[PDB]
């Protein structure tokens with residue numbers, strides 16, 4: 001996994017803050033993402049951003065596949081938001097579901113699944129790479145599980161369907177926590193089918209063991225326009 005420092009060229013800054021992320025070149029021939037300051041060495045999946053190489057002595061360098069559109073959150077908010085429509089958004093949701101199903105199967109917990117933590121490439125490829133996105137049992141008692149990730153996935157569906165807005169518009173953290181424990185849940189967002197809001201509701205069940213698996217979510221999302229909304233019609237935004 002270890003590569004020589006002189007094999008890397010750092011071209012453009014992409015982000016900063018703990019360290020930075022650059023776009024660059026590996027071995028003079030490969031566009032890569034470079035980040036400066038073991039799970040990533042074990043995990044492998046087409047919907048998981050792929051580690052390429054490391055420089056493991058301070059100053060440390062992490063080298064992964066390049067994702068050309070930046071974060072899903074940035075992508076949704078930018079020039080592309082205006083044009084995404086439910087079939088695109090449902091498709092991206094399904095890809096992430098697929099990523100998380102691999103994580104499910106491998107026995108890992110992600111713990112911070114949300115749009116800022118997903119990357120987007122060419123051709124709408126999406127890949128896996130604070131109260132408001134967190135399941136109550138996780139936020140309150142540190143019970144982080146795949147089931148709390150499923151909760152976050154529910155919140156990400158709303159980010160997808162509102163094209164990147166903050167969940168719980170106008171409420172502050174303390175307000176979200178209090179309200180959600182009292183049984184509040186986000187209503188159906190404008191022009192988004194009730195059947196998809198119902199999936200969100202399934203992710204936000206109080207009993208973490210009653211929430212759907214990712215394998216279930218992936219299959220539902222892949223099949224959505226044949227099995228669930230065979231008669232869908234694009235509207236003004238979705």
Ligand SMILES: COc1ccc(-c2nn(C3CCC3)c3ncnc(N)c23)cc1OC
Nearest residue numbers: 014015021033034035062064065066067071
């Ligand atoms: C855990 O390691 C990383 C996680 C995310 C990114 C990453 N971050 N970024 C941008 C910085 C804000 C999103 C990327 N852009 C394109 N491709 C990428 N792979 C990235 C880079 C990483 O290392 C190269």
